From a paper:
The Cryo-EM Structure of SfLptDE Contains Bound LptM. We obtained a complex of SfLptE with wild type E. coli LptD following expression of the Sfimp4213 variant of SfLptDE (SfLptD lacking residues 330 to 352 in extracellular loop 4). The LptDE complexes from Shigella and E. coli are virtually identical in sequence (three different residues in LptD and 1 different residue in LptE), and we consider this hybrid structure the same as SfLptDE. Buildable density is visible for the entire LptDE complex, except for residues Tyr38-Ala67 of LptD and the periplasmic C-terminus of LptE (Ser169-Asn193). Strikingly, additional density is visible close to periplasmic LptD loops and within the lumen of the complex. Density is lacking for the Ala31-Thr44 segment of LptM, likely due to it being in the periplasmic space, but the assignment of the rest of the protein is unambiguous. Parts of all three acyl chains of the N-terminal lipid anchor are visible, protruding into the DDM micelle via the LptD intramembrane hole previously identified, supporting the notion that LptM mimics LPS. The LptM region between Gln45 and Asn54 interacts extensively with LptE, analogous to the proposed interaction of LptE with translocating LPS. No populations of LptDE complexes lacking LptM were observed.
Numbering used by the authors:
A (entry chain A): 25 to 38, 67 to 93, 100 to 784
B (entry chain B): 19 to 169
C (entry chain C): 20A, 21 to 30, 44 to 67
Write the structure that this text describes.
């Protein structure tokens, strides 16, 4: 059974008399021996003596001597021990008092541990522990926190938050050791501003940097959506000064803001903003909001309005590139996208897409542009049970205004123009069929389907060498992207097309009509070469026409716990497999999984599609060949091991490795983690740089409902985080 | 050799008239699902309708995640993998509620020298992932009808 | 001594278009640790 219900069965669940007394008043019992009842003016008093057992639905009190008042509901148990009923918590005090309509449980020289009976892992002895049920807090005076029989620290006023209600105060600290910062210590303070907002201040002390970094978080919840701000500030850095002695100030900082929400169902607001002081911020400091694997920082704002058949958006897109080999970066400031849809215009469907963007560069020598795009579309869909054919026509009309071209036009043979018009139509036909057959030799009730697809695309040729390329990048051709009508993203390069795509998919369904297997193959056949007028890709072959692109996909759901995925791309102009990937996983539940995966990218693919210095730089030129393993398994129902190992078969060196162990008892939890990762490149010795990190977390349990085993936090904490592929 | 054209429809005959219900009715997944059902000749009704005998399709939580899938020899990102997960339920008027799901995987290479261009490529990829997830949910409708007959 | 927890308004979901880049899966629940 799970930990939450394993820690539950441990806890309890719901006029002298001179004899064995069992007096009950609705819910409260009293199994005392001698009870002395008085009604002096009435002021009704109960004086219990001998093995007093004040059983209840909330507490179990045991004591040699007792006392109670039936008017003000004031009790007194001498030299006793209590125990919560229906919840976790127990202790022992020299005097237990219930006051204020059974609100305060006051203990004199008492203790409190939320550990199960017979276990004494930790305790907190005070002298005036008070449990307040309106505030859900346990105030302790002259507190001494004890582990086993040995105290570890003393401090007055050591409140313990009981329950799940939020409170403002110090959180339990955590520590690390990394090779970049040495020993590190975080001491968080949580501020509970309001139900829909809160803040957290964390002094993060790094031994090697010789100063404290201040981390400030602010979360909010509004009508316009939910957000999060982060502002870290390190006033001075000792390591950074040595590497950069010329800089007058060595401050390091990070600003982060993320917003997302929809208001009144028609207004969509988004923010994704990151700014850092220097390129090497994430190679030194570990954040949840950035990774050492980043290449730049994204700074985007967006405001949109969407209805059933229309939407408009205004946005800005800016980027902060880290590498010193890149100094020019374009931005959209601003961009406007408008879509309008109208169906059932006869048998046709119509659509319009317009845009207006302004491009600015960080450099002051680069071209600057304004572009307006219009794109009306009309299609005629036809369908029946076993097939569908969709014929489409489109017009692509663009206008440019390019300024600041003096510096570019001087050092390039072909010149950019100041005013460009580009009008080109596009015609496409897309077909589909489905076949079926009863596949009974596999298992009774199964079926198999065969779904061949074809498409024809034609776009004429326009010479676009007088337009600078601001926002067009080459798109991948996987099986899904074989039937795409574009070769580039954006609108600066629109290649010609005279081609036919053919593909086929097969699926296997079982008797419950649930899909088990699917496999896909396809190709693109070119009747003429695709040219934008500015063609400088580095192909290994001088092939222009014919069957040049191939792709495939697979997915087999072997069981409810097994899964297999695959995908391969082949390009004849590379004379090699462009990219490939594979993955197999067994996953019983969240705490039991094994996964193997492989990723490939050829050296020729890196040369063709990525910058020109990638094909000559040692850390880029070989492509990708990576084997990974991820595992997670519990031992003895309390321990939980998580591991990951990624290996580069080209260099015969690892990329990443991780190992985490957590022990989660019924009254505490301890986690220790380790990770070694690639963290830069040494340009003098031409070898990679690694970073090691060990983290230690501790936690108290039994006071709130939290009983997590920490598996998902550990599985997602490395540079190549775990993705569920089942 | 045993093959024949698909004689039965894609969407079950029971779900020829449906109610499309969503907490973000003007969002990208609702537009993708509504267009996909319109291709299959399904008549969609408003949530606040007088009909009390039509199945209701409810669109739930949608998650999109972009993670590092592979790295170069300096630790920098080489490939990003995007995963889209969609949850939904189909309520038959009188029977139980049948949940369905979708999951779409895509990947692409990163280029810090053309970061604006790679931003537009990612926006294009997400639109396609919304079309695929809308198809996967509709291919699960015959599985719900089969479970209905069993119960 | 403080407890950190989920936010709520003082007394299905939206289909986004921006993915969560490298989410660290730090769960949002009542805890005395930072997460
Ligand atoms: C208000 C508290 C929040 O924490 C609490 O709820 C109170 C209990 C404190 C939890 C301690 C858990 C860590 C110690 C366990 C033993 C070490 C590990 C054992 C082997 C694996 O605020 C806090 O954040 C807690 C206090 C901060 C940490 C305390 C560290 C020691 C402090 C020593 C200073 C005392 C100096 C004066 C007395 C000598």
């Amino acid at each position: 059974a799970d930990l939450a219900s394993q820690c539950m069965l441990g806890v309890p669940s719901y006029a002298v008399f001179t004899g064995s007394v069992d007096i009950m008043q609705g819910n409260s019992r009293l199994q005392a021996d001698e009870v002395q009842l008085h009604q002096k003016e009435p002021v009704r008093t109960v004086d219990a003596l001998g093995n007093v057992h004040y059983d209840d639905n909330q507490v179990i009190l045991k004591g040699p001597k007792g006392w109670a008042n039936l008017n003000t509901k004031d009790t007194n148990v001498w030299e006793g021990d209590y125990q919560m009923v229906g919840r976790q918590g127990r202790g022992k005090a020299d005097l237990m008092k219930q006051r204020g309509e059974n609100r305060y449980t006051i203990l004199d020289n008492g203790s409190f541990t939320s550990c199960l009976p017979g276990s004494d892992t930790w305790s907190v002895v005070g002298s005036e522990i008070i449990h307040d049920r309106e505030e859900q807090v346990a105030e302790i005076w002259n507190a001494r926190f004890k582990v086993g029989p040995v105290p570890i620290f003393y401090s007055p006023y050591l409140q313990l938050p009981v329950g799940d209600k939020r409170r403002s105060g110090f959180l339990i600290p955590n520590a690390k050791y990394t090779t970049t910062n040495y020993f590190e210590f975080y001491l968080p303070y949580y501020w509970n501003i309001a139900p829909n907002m809160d803040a957290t201040i964390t002094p993060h002390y790094m031994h090697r940097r010789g100063n404290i970094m201040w981390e400030n978080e602010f979360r909010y919840l509004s009508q316009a959506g939910a957000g999060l701000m982060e502002l870290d500030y390190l006033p001075s850095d000792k390591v950074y000064e040595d590497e950069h002695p010329n800089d007058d100030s060595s401050r390091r900082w990070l600003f982060y803001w993320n917003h997302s929400g929809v208001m009144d169902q028609v207004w969509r607001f988004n923010v994704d903003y990151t700014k850092v002081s220097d390129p090497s911020y994430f190679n030194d400091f570990d954040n949840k909001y950035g990774s050492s694997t980043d290449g730049y920082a994204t700074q985007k704002f967006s405001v949109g309005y969407a209805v059933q058949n229309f939407n408009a958006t205004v946005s800005t897109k800016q980027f902060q590139v880290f590498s010193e080999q890149n100094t020019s970066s374009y931005s959209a400031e601003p961009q406007l996208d408008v879509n309008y849809y109208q169906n059932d215009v006869g048998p046709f469907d119509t659509r319009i897409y317009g845009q207006a963007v302004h491009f600015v560069n960080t450099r002051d020598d680069m071209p600057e542009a304004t572009r307006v795009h219009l794109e009306p579309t009309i299609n005629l869909p036809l369908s029946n049970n076993w097939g569908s054919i969709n014929t489409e026509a489109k017009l692509l009309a663009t206008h440019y205004q390019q300024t600041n071209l003096d510096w570019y036009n001087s050092r390039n043979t072909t010149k950019l123009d100041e005013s460009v018009n580009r009008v080109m139509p596009q015609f496409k036909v897309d077909g589909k069929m489905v076949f079926e057959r009863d596949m009974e030799m596999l298992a009774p009730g199964y079926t198999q389907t065969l779904e061949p697809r074809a498409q024809y695309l034609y776009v004429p040729y326009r010479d676009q060498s007088d337009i600078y390329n601001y926002d067009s990048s080459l798109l991948q051709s996987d099986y899904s992207g074989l039937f795409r009508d574009r070769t580039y993203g954006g609108l600066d390069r629109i290649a010609s097309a005279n081609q036919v795509t053919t593909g086929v998919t097969s699926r296997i369904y079982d008797d419950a009509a649930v899909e088990r297997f699917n496999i896909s193959v396809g190709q693109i056949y070119y009747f003429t070469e695709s040219r934008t007028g500015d063609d400088n890709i580095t192909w290994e072959n001088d092939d222009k026409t014919g069957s040049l692109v191939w792709a495939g996909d697979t997915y087999w759901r072997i069981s409810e716990r097994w899964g297999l995925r695959g995908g391969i791309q082949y390009d004849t102009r590379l004379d090699n497999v462009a990219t490939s990937n594979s993955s197999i996983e067994y996953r019983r539940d969240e705490d039991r999984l094994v996964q193997l995966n492989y990723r490939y990218a050829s050296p020729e693919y890196i040369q063709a599609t990525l910058p020109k210095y990638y094909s000559t730089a040692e850390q880029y030129k070989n492509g990708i060949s990576q084997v990974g393993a991820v595992a997670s398994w519990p031992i003895a129902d309390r321990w939980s091991i998580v591991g990951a190992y990624y290996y580069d078969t080209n260099a015969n060196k690892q990329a990443d490795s991780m190992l985490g162990v957590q022990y989660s008892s019924c009254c505490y939890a301890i986690r220790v983690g380790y990770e070694r990762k690639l963290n830069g490149w040494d340009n003098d010795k031409q070898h990679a740089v690694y970073d090691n990190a060990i983290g230690f977390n501790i936690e108290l349990r039994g006071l709130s409902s939290n009983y997590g085993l920490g598996t998902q936090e550990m599985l997602r904490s490395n540079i190549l985080p775990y993705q569920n592929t089942l | 050799c045993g093959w024949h054209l698909r004689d039965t429809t894609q969407v079950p005959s029971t779900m020829k008239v449906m109610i499309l219900d969503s907490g973000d009715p003007n969002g990208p997944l609702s537009r993708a699902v509504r267009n996909q059902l319109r291709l299959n000749g399904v008549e969609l009704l408003d949530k606040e309708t007088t009909r009390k005998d039509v199945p209701s399709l409810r669109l739930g939580k949608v998650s999109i995640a972009k993670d590092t899938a592979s790295v170069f020899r300096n630790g920098q990102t080489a490939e990003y993998q995007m995963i889209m997960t969609v949850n939904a339920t189909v309520l038959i008027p009188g029977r139980d509620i049948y949940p369905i799901s979708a999951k779409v995987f895509r990947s692409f290479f990163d280029n810090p020298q053309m970061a604006l261009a790679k931003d537009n490529e990612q926006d294009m990829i997400v639109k396609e992932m919304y079309d695929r997830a809308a198809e996967q949910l509709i291919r699960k409708l015959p599985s719900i009808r089969a479970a209905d007959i069993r119960s | 001594c403080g407890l950190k927890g989920p936010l709520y308004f003082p007394p299905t979901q939206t289909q986004s278009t921006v993915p969560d880049k490298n989410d660290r899966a730090t769960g949002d629940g009542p805890s005395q640790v930072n997460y």
